[model samples]
Target: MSYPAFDSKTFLEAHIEKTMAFYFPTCIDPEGGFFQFFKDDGSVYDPNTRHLVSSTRFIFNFAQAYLHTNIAEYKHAAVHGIQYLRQRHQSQSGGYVWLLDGGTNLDETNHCYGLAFVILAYSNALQIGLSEAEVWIEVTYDLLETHFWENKHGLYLDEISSDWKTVSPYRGQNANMHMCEALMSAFDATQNPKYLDRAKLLAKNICQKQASLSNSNEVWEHYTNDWQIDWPWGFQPGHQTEWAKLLLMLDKRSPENWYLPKAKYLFDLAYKKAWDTKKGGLHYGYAPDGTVCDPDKYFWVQAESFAAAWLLYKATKDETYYKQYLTLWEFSWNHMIDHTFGAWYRILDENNAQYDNNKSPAGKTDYHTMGACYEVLKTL
Candidate 1:
């Protein structure tokens, strides 16, 4: 089977166009923010439910689309989503609400993960000329600082009660990883050195400090309050690739001498451990001892890894990384993308077989896939 040149601007743009086609028109909720869930045939599975991640990610999708296409509709979609974010998701208690049922709030938990996406959404919105998003960016950052920042550890704490009284002892690298991503976007949008500075600190603490807990460059996921690895059983390859992508982004923004080497190491580590030798794509996860734990293929994992591979190629001008990029894309096009329905499938079994019809769930909006393409395009 033939695949388009994975590194070309034309192919990336067309892929974004097709991926966005799956969401827009159908995704827009007449009552409020975009719908959260979808089935295989591009139908909304749950119309009334909403999640903060999806809400913010849709903003990212449209903001990126508007940036690339220069289309007013995409801009409008982003603006529309941002308004819903401020009006609906942002609770009177300060942090964004986690779950909602139409106009009602279901979960009042204040998660740093959810808030990181809020910063990311506003940053992208500002990129698309939403001037109001500038203030919201600072507003949300301050909220994060006040509620979640752990100065001693140089990382954000995990979850807390909406009332701001009780905090969970659960520490995590996922939220900080995303906060690092948001801060970089915030820096790009506003040129605020504070955001960039904070991003650098996060990279050092999580990617280096917490990662040092393992003998290798392995960035652990769950952690105790002191950032010790809590669940030391399994590892996710997608996160390694995602961090590689961010470290490369950080290398460009902050130009640390260690950033590029670390990014390359993480990417290489993930490829070594998780890529299915018999199958064509990366597996979802593996054990800490280098055993395959979960052999399923996930949409975001493939998308992010491919983007990291492309960035690696661009950074080093290495044909090997470029070939890896093409290989990942080809596997995605053959086994992941829904040629008939429009967007990519959510997950596939070890043999690359479809698991079910659930496509866009609470956290998915093809945000990772389209965002990966947009990130690569920005490099060009």
Candidate 2:
């Protein structure tokens, strides 16, 4: 099958531009923050409800866009996004809220995942010339360390109440993985060793320490309060793909011996076990025994997997990873990308059929899709 030059820098830059255009002017909320929900047709579905994840990711999208295109409007939009984060999402107790219904706080629980993204958002904001974002980055990092950091385990705890009186027993790799990402972003923004130091620590703990628990050395999703592996939550390929690339990024900076082997293992495992050879896209997840648990297709799964493949190809100079990268992009271009409208379809059935019109749901700001492109461009 014929494919566009996926390795081309021009193609990647244009892809980023096209994807950002889907959200830019339409998603910009003159009233306050950007809209969190959008239908498949690029129309806002829920104009009032705001989510911390979406609020923060939109800042990433805009600020990232500004850095790419030198567009002043994107910089302005990013500036607008950070204000909503501070004014609307952050609570009186100094933790960001999970959800909001207009101005009313809906779920005030402080999630480490949300705060991680806040760090990432502010880091990008700082990179894009928002001078005040440096303070926010530090403030958010200190908050995480104070409330969420579990020094014993070398990872951050998952969640806590806004009042800080109660903490959930659930431990998750999701938050810590994202926290690693935010740390890298902070490192890039501030040139601080502490950020990279924590990122390396989290990477070691998650990709190695926790992974050693399983027979296949696979990273599990959930865990007990004490960091025991919780078997029921299963596994996600997108996450594996994400970790593979993230580890490579870390290796690029710190020159670690362990990161490359683990990254290659993850990328190979996800490709071999999770990809549906019949339907031409990766499955959502798999069980411990290599059973296809969630056979559905997700936009982020393809986007991130392709990005990992590209990074692996660059690092190893292997033709196999290059072909894998091209194949994933081909599948996404054919199935996941919404050619008629813009952006990508959020979910698809086993046959790659659309499940709904909810394109930009609360947490998905096409951050994964555009983010994949951005990461690839950096390698070029």
Candidate 3:
């Protein structure tokens, strides 16, 4: 029933511990709640820009880790984050802010990703018995359905005005993918059929309508407001993997035949097109023609791929995905894992080296890597 090598209890535990060890100390910023920037060389690179996305992701991280381990300390940390976001990140309007400064000046873009993360962070918080989560979920759920939701396509938009009065014409699969996650998480927390059905509808559109019915098997960033494919370049394998995993998660809650089949197709092209031949891992982005256009491999992609591969492997017991999972762990750990430092490196160039540019933080605050690790544990 269990594969000892990939499914090793000790291996997963060590990764969880080390990832938290890397995540905990560096993440706690005295200014607000959690700072956005963290570096590999022990430098908090940019303290001024506080990203709401990263903060809520860590909230999901800790809450999920707590749920997995029943560790009160992790729950406590998650609770603090939940409360902190409620107090500070709440905008004058019902929607949440996108980012914050060190001194409380916030970027008041009521974007879809921020709303989805609120659902994600608070849904996990609710599981830990946080009473404040309900209202946050209520407000954001209204905003999503009332404003961002498009009845025609059954999808959400990327950005909105601060007042929620105006909507951006642009559409993106990225936010919608995350919205699928948020809707599913909200459903998990509240057992709301509305959220569940909406999640399924979005999943169906994304899995069945988006690419499956189309002639080409591709997933990318840009799209029209009406869900037409616009720019097909920069095929995001990470998103493909994420959708594969999320659809599986949805099907797990409510069993379906469509989820894993769609997930398999998604992963197949993701590997077939974007995988690095010589170095042995996923590339950041690939062209439409199956060439590795962007050679840079991100930690988040590897994290998502690892989780997706593990889930498919566990479900099907297929050696192909299992070995691919093994290969990712091997290549990713050697290049990205911070054996010397803490957490994983956020990005690595094609040469398997770090620090090509210092625009963002060197290493992240352990959200994606840790999130992936926990998902792997739960899926396995």
Candidate 4:
């Protein structure tokens, strides 16, 4: 039940191999992009459906895998997705389309969340020494900035029409979080001071308005155009943990450590707010008043939380975070993993039984699993 030895290096290598082997040599899609879903037992699901997020995720993770393992096939897989991203998913107007059923842009939905992943993929694609990545990243970045970036408010907008014409007044931390994530990586690759400046500005505003203003323990998800809290939607423990890890990265990157305190604060708050004592997994969402909203527990959520705990432990050499890391790893291995097949299961009920949802599939790609492994292993 417990890995007393707690060897993150060995643990990561095994899972990375299993995840890669589980996914590759299947579902390359006879059309253009990768297949949408796969069953737990290794069967393809809806080969006709493929979205921008899944495509970008594939590119990001496989590019990352090649970086870690120095394998040619990993790069090949990532290049495959990258080609699809630039060719099919991109919009002629500006930004990228959200969904595509086999290379056809069924709707030119330009969700900022999806574009953030495009930035991520192209930014990461820089690692492969591809000149096209710079062009791709810059084009998307410029489109996103011109369309979504509300300069008056440091945070970006939620979504816009495919033409980047009419923008939504509804804003949320999720898109901005990923925007900050992409900006950070882009800054890292180019050492662009402006990217870092934008990232810091957004981080300070988000942490101040959403996190620090939560009266000590909550982060509001939805928001108005001017960054005022929208009360209906709630907190995401996964995002809290995601921001925690990101803030830590920001600290290590920037000269000043302004983001670190809020990083630790949000992580602790989310740890208490969502940890389920009875079932032992992070809840999907928390009401603003500090109760469970959506009760589903997801593997990607636990994966980010686990990586955060491990990173914190490594940063401070704190036994508390270390224990937290181990407990999360144990819970995830027991319930989050798909032992019968490969890769982590997308969703599990409160009882830890497999639940089908459009978000997480048993045959999902290697983004979270390989990512968590690489991150936690590096910390070790």
Candidate 5:
């Protein structure tokens, strides 16, 4: 099967409506907060479970959808999500808990990336006409200032325990990317140069840590504060591609900055290492030695890679990136789409088989991927 040729505008509008209608309405936990995960069919796995990370993604996507469609439903969903976060999920010390396990288990611990997500989501809500936007904004501000901000290191810490006393510094590309995103959003909302300054600092940190003399100076997977290569735990080829996109944004924001070269280098490495020449899809991850990390192809990774390629092409006017985008679109259209199910499958394993049987209690489908597609459809 191939992707049906359609106008980008029409496709994005349809996709937004379909996603909003299918996932938005059913997933909200009416009694209080959002579920950590949901079934593919839209049933909540545990009404009481609340994942700050997943909830933030949900809020960000809904807010973006509302921005695109100007639909009240999307706005309402965004409001509910924000309220849940404020009333239920936030910890006494200012930052949010990582997970609210079905109201029964309140693991009020913070994830490294939680504040970033909160910042993005809350700031986006303000943009999209949520009433309590300022309140959420302040909440996120407090969280960032009270917990994650590190004056000593001149960078935000990853995650803190509920009391804001315990610190963990395990680094991941996604964490840094989201931190960039959150800071960008906060800068937009507050017009504070500090936020932008922090964002640039974080971007520089990413470049310094990831770029290598060999391998075309592509970004590595994970790093320590002292710039040592940590285990390639969460390093995915798709994430490298996504990081390139973020770096491109950073470059655009600071045009004369030296980061553009590093961004281009990382983009080149992802293109060479990840893009499948014959199969026409990006692989999941690559080993540091440049071997395939995993042969499996996930729908979210493909969607994100496509978006990254598209964004890089837009930023650089590079035709090769555009061609790669089309190749990814073709692969996703062929392998992941479920015409009957009306959404892409979650995973495609080594044999290129879609695994629909497995689903997350919190809607196993990657909301971030769908959000990425929404962005791609709009830009493409």
Candidate 6:
């Protein structure tokens, strides 16, 4: 049979628009800044809570929605999110806060979350005509280079303590992904080869590390500063999938990179181990020894897995990857999508049941699914 057709127009205008609407009501705050967390009922989980990464993603999603639909509502939401961050969270130390608890107390100083998202939000805003785009872009570039970049290792650090002297022990694949994303954003906003070079270098590091550490074709879940392996977590399986997607994108831009082979190998590992052959959906995590760790299917993991499968199909035109995509699409449609509610559940167990009564908290929304859907339509 021919590959299933995925019409972007229909998907964006219908399913994506419906899903995006779920976040519109929760996109702003009454007290003048956007709340980061929400409840399942679509209410703010912590009215005073703020997260730089989530807020930045909120803006990026709204901006993208506006670009896709030409909807003024989306534009307004995007502007509100940007204004909230610029006004409240811009730090005196040249980097943004790790957390803006309730718009008042700043939790930590050295997180790269803000640096990554600032690049995303402002770079996207620049693409669509925002006057302050240049300013935000410059600030993001400076912050990332100044605080996060490690010239010695040629990779970005995760977080710093208040004194900014010591790095936190929590580095992982997520930081690498965000940094890659930030570099892409910077390159898009400005055709600077510096950002692209940094991105390629980071991609090389991840690709090399995955090749060395991936056991029995399964990418190890975590690593230390020196690239030593560590324990797996709920998010590492998804990270492997995401890293594969990034490698595919980078390969498109720089095909001669020797790391493409490693990227493809890791992608295969992700597909074989994390992806469910019987159930037709991706699993969340597996132990390094190849034991199934957590079988719960999180919304975000499903989203990333779908994107990775699609990217693989695009790069190789492999019918198997397309089949994988369809399998995931089927599972997502049947389990995650709330047909009546017009969004998706946040978490579902292996049996396709909601993990908890509070899984759909309002602040969580469905932005991840929306972005994943955006990619799905493009690839489908």
* RMSD per model, one decimal: 1.2, 1.0, 2.8, 2.2, 2.9, 2.9
* Superposition TM-score, candidate 3 onto the true structure: 0.93
On the 0 to 100 scale, the lDDT of residue 141 in model 6 is 72
Ranking by TM-score: 2, 1, 4, 3, 6, 5
lDDT of 4 by residue, 1-380 (tens): 43534445776787777777667767576556577687776677677767778888888777888888899987888888888887887767766767767545787877888888888888888877786776777777787777788888777888887655788888888888888888887887777677788788777778765665565545578777867766635788998888888778777788456566676777888988889899898989887678888888888789889888877777777788888888787888788777667677888887887766343342247587677678777666
Candidate 6: tens digits of C-alpha lDDT, residues 248-354: 77776666555456556666777677776666567778766656688878788777777777887777788987777777777887787777656677777778788
Residue 364 local lDDT, model 6: 52
**Taking the tens digit of each residue's C-alpha lDDT, what string does model 2 give over 1-380?**
27778889998887778788889799889999999999988999999898999999999999999898899998899989988888888878889889988768899999999999999999998998778888888988998889999999999999998799899999999999999999999999999899999999999999999999887888899899989988635788899989999999999999899888899999999889998898788998898889999898999899989989999998999899999998898888888888877788888999989978888888889999999999999888
- Tens-place lDDT per residue, model 1, 31-122, is 77898899989889899899999999999999988887998999988988998998998878778889999667899899999999999999
TM-score of 6: 0.89
TM-score of each: 0.98, 0.98, 0.93, 0.94, 0.88, 0.89
Count of clashes in candidate 3: 0
Residues 1-380, candidate 3: write the lDDT tens digits. 23336456677777778777766756666655765676665456776776778778878878887887888888878877876787788767777767777556567878888888888988998888977777668778887888888888878888988866777888888888888888888888888788888888888877777774344465567778778877636788998898888877887888789788878888888977778889777888887766778888888898888888888887788899988988888887678877865567777788888865332351255667777777787754
- Global lDDT for candidate 3? 0.77
Clashing pairs in 4: none
Which candidate model has the greater TM-score, 1 or 3? 1
What's the lDDT of the predicted structure labeled candidate 4?
0.77
Local distance difference test values of all predictions, in order:
0.90, 0.90, 0.77, 0.77, 0.67, 0.70
